[PDB]
């Protein structure tokens, strides 16, 4: 098995957010070309999404839980930077982030 914290991040934290009703805009990288966002990569220098986080966890690419938590926080922050605060996608990110912080508060000790 993986370390307690990384296993918890994949089997509890990522799974809970992945299967949430608001997960779908975050399940894959933002395709700025298809979405016609010519400024997205100028504004968002470090893109991140849950599909990438899921692959890193499943392939045991993270060295510790902090690297994974930072990726989730980057994903949320990117959404807040690029979009207007009243927009549906920001409300969705905020609800996912609230759930994320609740599950992170119960991360098992090593």
């Amino acid at each position: 098995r993986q370390t307690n914290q990384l296993q918890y991040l994949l089997r509890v934290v990522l799974k809970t957010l992945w299967k949430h009703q608001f997960a779908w805009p975050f399940q894959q990288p933002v395709d700025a070309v298809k979405l016609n966002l010519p400024d997205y990569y100028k504004i968002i220098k470090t893109p991140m999404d849950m599909g990438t986080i899921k692959k890193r966890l499943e392939n045991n690419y993270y060295w510790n839980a902090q690297e994974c938590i930072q990726d989730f926080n980057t994903m949320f922050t990117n959404c807040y930077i690029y979009n207007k605060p009243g927009d549906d996608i920001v409300l969705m990110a905020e609800a996912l982030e609230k759930l994320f912080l609740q599950k992170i508060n119960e991360l098992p000790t090593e």
Binding site: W24, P25, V30, L35, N36, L37, N83, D88, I89
Partner: peptide, 17 residues
């Protein structure tokens, strides 16, 4: 527009651009 088909054939869209 971001678009998705969710389980149950639920459709959702978001006007990102």
């Amino acid at each position: 527009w971001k678009k998705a088909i969710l389980p149950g054939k639920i459709l959702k869209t978001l006007h990102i651009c």
